[PDB]
Symmetry: none
Subunit: 208 residues, 2 copies
């Protein structure tokens, strides 16, 4: 939640906007330009990916500070959980605040510093290790049952999206992409759209 | 990488420190109080959790701004990849960069704000323990691309141990066993040894 009490002290300079339960406060595909100080209530912010699929991003709460001040490659979609009162802070507004009171620059900066730490930790905590073994297993398995030695190699005539792959192994699309890529590099296998071609069943199996 | 060019403009106010390849630039359990502006080179950040397990966290490179000005909850351990030249910015140092120039407040804001956008997306992008939605997914995938419409039904001539199935989805032989069995009595599919027969591809795809 990452509160900034010290900011209540200034909402009297921002613009106050007030949202009923259910009301959309940030819209998908919209160009945000204000810090949104959450004086009271609760907000759900869902992210919407390049493929229309939605997914929760975070809840914000009292004294929380949301919002693109500049476009952040994220389509968001925020909603009010309860009756929520916000104070909107423009850049222009923010400047004045800082001039009365310069310590405020640093609490906005603390705020953000923890925010990065906190999510950065949790990426790092994602266990990318099994789910990588699991991926290979999938390919060996597919291969040694569907695979068709074509000369040196083995072919499978199998559509298989990275999505499907992550969906099947529970592996992050990043892992999926990077695991793929360096399997291709090291000559073990390469996946086309219609076909994967295996270059080294001996080794594939070896990493599992 | 998350650069801030506009900060090379102010190294002259910071204190410049220069680290050779392999040099440590944060020791573990080292309480940091200065933003670190990476002028040229490369830096390795590993996080160390409460249980002494290390992991990579990120690489930082030219114009990158690493550092905490405050405690974050993360034990970090940073290392030089090549010879690298950093400028270190205190809070006290920073306050002065922001009076000369108030436009650099917002740059540090934009920056961290991207960084927060970036990591959070990554957390949202992720694939809540499933493990049973995983299994089905597999079977739909196999089935629609490998099945031959045999009258009412679709067959796939495909050895598939339950061992292989848990190995792939990282699901427990029980879960597998139980997920299989009830798929049989609810008429969606049964799996023989050489062969699985899909009674109801319409439903399979639904259960996912």
């Amino acid at each position: 939640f990452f509160p900034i009490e010290k900011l209540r002290n200034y909402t009297d300079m921002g613009i106050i906007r007030e949202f009923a339960k259910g009301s959309a406060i940030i819209m998908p595909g919209e160009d945000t330009t204000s810090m949104i100080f959450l004086m009271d209530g609760k907000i759900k912010l869902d992210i919407i990916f390049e493929d229309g699929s939605e997914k929760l991003l975070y809840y914000a709460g009292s004294n929380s500070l949301i919002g693109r001040l500049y476009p952040t490659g994220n389509n968001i979609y925020a909603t009010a959980m309860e009756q929520t009162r916000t104070c909107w802070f423009s850049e222009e507004c923010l400047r004045v605040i800082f001039r009365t009171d310069e310590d405020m620059i640093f609490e906005i900066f603390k705020n953000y510093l923890t925010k990065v730490a906190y999510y950065a930790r949790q990426v790092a905590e994602i266990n990318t290790y099994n789910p990588t073994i699991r991926i290979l297993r999938l390919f060996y398995e597919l291969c040694s049952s569907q695979g068709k030695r074509v000369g040196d190699t083995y072919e499978i005539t199998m559509p298989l999206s990275q999505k499907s792959i992550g969906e099947i192994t529970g592996a992050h699309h990043v892992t999926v992409s990077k695991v793929l890529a360096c399997l291709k590099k090291e000559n073990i296998l390469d996946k086309k759209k219609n076909k994967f071609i295996v270059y080294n069943l001996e080794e594939l199996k070896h990493l599992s």
